Amino acid sequence: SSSVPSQKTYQGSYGFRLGFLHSGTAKSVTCTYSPALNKLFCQLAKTCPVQLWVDSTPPPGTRVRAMAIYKQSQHMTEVVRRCPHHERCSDSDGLAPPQHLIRVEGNLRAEYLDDRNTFRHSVVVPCEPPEVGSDCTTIHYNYMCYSSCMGGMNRRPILTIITLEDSSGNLLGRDSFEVRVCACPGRDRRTEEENLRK
Amino acid sequence: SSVPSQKTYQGSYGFRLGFLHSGTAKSVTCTYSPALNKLFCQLAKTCPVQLWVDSTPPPGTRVRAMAIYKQSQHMTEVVRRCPHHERCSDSDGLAPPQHLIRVEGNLRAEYLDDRNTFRHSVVVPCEPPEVGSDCTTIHYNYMCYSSCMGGMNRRPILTIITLEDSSGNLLGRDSFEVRVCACPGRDRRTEEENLRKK
Ligand SMILES: *c1ncc(C#N)nc1C
Ligand SMILES: *c1ncc(C#N)nc1C
Ligand SMILES: *c1ncc(C#N)nc1C
Ligand SMILES: [Zn+2]
Ligand SMILES: [Zn+2]
């Protein structure tokens, strides 16, 4: 039903790429990234830190956008949205529409887009230089449905596409990662990595 | 209701909170857990909170306190006193009976019912430390138990403390969880043991 945004990795002029913390797989972890799977595992509505790395500084007014798509070919034309249960939660922070799967945490300049032509959802923030004593910028994302939610993702894998954009929205860079939103991210990362090694 | 930001922000003046070291004896009425960033206190008892800055903010700076529910699914609900305690004859002459958080012993305290969000807050002028001291102390009271039915109803809350200029613009922000309970020392010990075992 909708055109599919590109997921092709594109570093661009500024050498744009993502990075992830090394959180491990203990029972207490709430967000953990698998480099072998290029896959983030996270709990519902919990902080997911994503690093933005560049080789050179983009202009003021550069923005960073996040959008989810279904990974599998037969589902990629379907808009990823919150399930019929969670979209009816009165849990908006006042910026995010209740249908949106991906939110930004702790940024009052976050903007949420419902695309008038494709109906896809995305959240965009200004790109900012690293804080004092840091080499990268970090964005905190929250995912507001479980991968297993019926009538929503319904156990289908998704990708998050992160795009670096100029102030008009033109593409400057692109990267992406798979996401599973689940109750036990550490256990599930261990299982999927063990499965991969066999 | 939209959700106030809880992001820690030291700002230009290096603003942050501090708490005295009270211990967990059975006789303690107010005790702070740094490991949990959580204050445990009895109903309507004095809670001293230290205000620290690295440099002096301008005259007319104010300090506001507001409570929100900690859990995502409840953050949009206004935190207020339960149907029982809002009808207690316990007015101090300044605080409206519906407000959970009071400032004790400050005749310049002002209480706000926000006309757009309906949230409650209490604000006082920010003052420099007394002679011989290095920080300023505010005394708060929490006027409902965490367990009160029809009020917090066993849901955790956060207190957000904001440093504001004379127009109400943000200069600094800090926050902490609160449990209002009959046995704060015992409950702090239990929750800290639970955290270690996790
Ligand atoms: C965005 N804007 C600026 C900078 C720098 N330096 N980095 C990003 C990711
Ligand atoms: C508020 N106003 C002034 C000062 C100083 N010095 N501190 C506060 C917390
Ligand atoms: C809870 N904690 C301490 C004490 C005392 N003394 N009593 C209770 C109920
Ligand atoms: Zn859902
Ligand atoms: Zn009550």
Token pair, residue A104, equals: 């930004």
Q: How far is the CA of A2 from the centre of ligand 5 (A)?
A: 51
Closest CA to A85 of A142, A157, A149: A149
Token pair, residue A182, equals: 């689940």
Q: Which atom of ligand 2 is nearest to the CA of B52?
A: 9
In B44-97, alpha helices (H): none
Closest CA to A175 of A33, A2, A19, A35: A19
Query: What is the C-alpha to C-alpha distance for residues B34 and B11, in angstroms, rounded to an integer?
Result: 22
- How is the beta sheet containing B157-164 ordered, strand by strand? B30-33, B38-41, B170-180, B157-164, B62-69, B120-125, B110-113
Contacts of B133 (CB under 8 A, 6+ apart): none
Chain-chain contact of A90 with B72 (C-beta, under 8 angstroms): no
Most B CBs within 10 Å: which of A93, A95, A109, as the mutation test of the B interface?
A: A93
Q: Atom 5 (ligand 1): residue with closest C-alpha?
A: A129
Query: What is the C-alpha to C-alpha distance for residues B173 and B13, in angstroms, rounded to an integer?
Result: 11
Cα of A88 vs its chain's centroid, Å? 22
Domains and CATH numbers, chain A: 3-197 (2.60.40.720)
Resolution, expressed in angstroms to one decimal: 1.6
| Burial category of B78 from C-beta neighbours within 10 Å (exposed 0-12, middle 13-18, buried 19 and up) | middle
CB-based contact B18:B46 (threshold 8 Å): no
Token pair, residue B83, equals: 């149907």
Q: Is the dihedral of CA A31, A34, A40, A42 positive or negative?
A: negative
Chain-chain contact of A94 with B5 (C-beta, under 8 angstroms): no
Cα of B25 vs its chain's centroid, Å? 22
Chain-chain contact of B73 with A92 (C-beta, under 8 angstroms): no
Query: What is the C-alpha to C-alpha distance for residues B49 and A129, in angstroms, rounded to an integer?
Result: 34
In B94-179, alpha helices (H): none
Query: What is the C-alpha to C-alpha distance for residues A8 and A69, in angstroms, rounded to an integer?
Result: 13
- How many CA atoms within 13 Å lie on the side-chain side of B15? 28
Q: Indicate the residue type of B183.
A: C
For residue B168, is it left (φ>0), alpha (ψ between -120 and 50) or beta? left
Query: What is the C-alpha to C-alpha distance for residues B118 and A146, in angstroms, rounded to an integer?
Result: 31
What is the β-pairing status of strands A158-165 and A171-181? antiparallel
Residue B2 contacts A, CB cutoff 8 Å: yes
Question: What residues form DSSP beta bridges with A32?
Answer: A41
CB-based contact A16:A173 (threshold 8 Å): yes
Query: What is the C-alpha to C-alpha distance for residues B68 and A131, in angstroms, rounded to an integer?
Result: 28
Residue A90 contacts B, CB cutoff 8 Å: yes
Angle CA B170–B171–B174, to nearest 5: 90
Cβ-Cβ contacts under 8 Å, A108 against chain B: 5
Chain-chain contact of A92 with B2 (C-beta, under 8 angstroms): yes
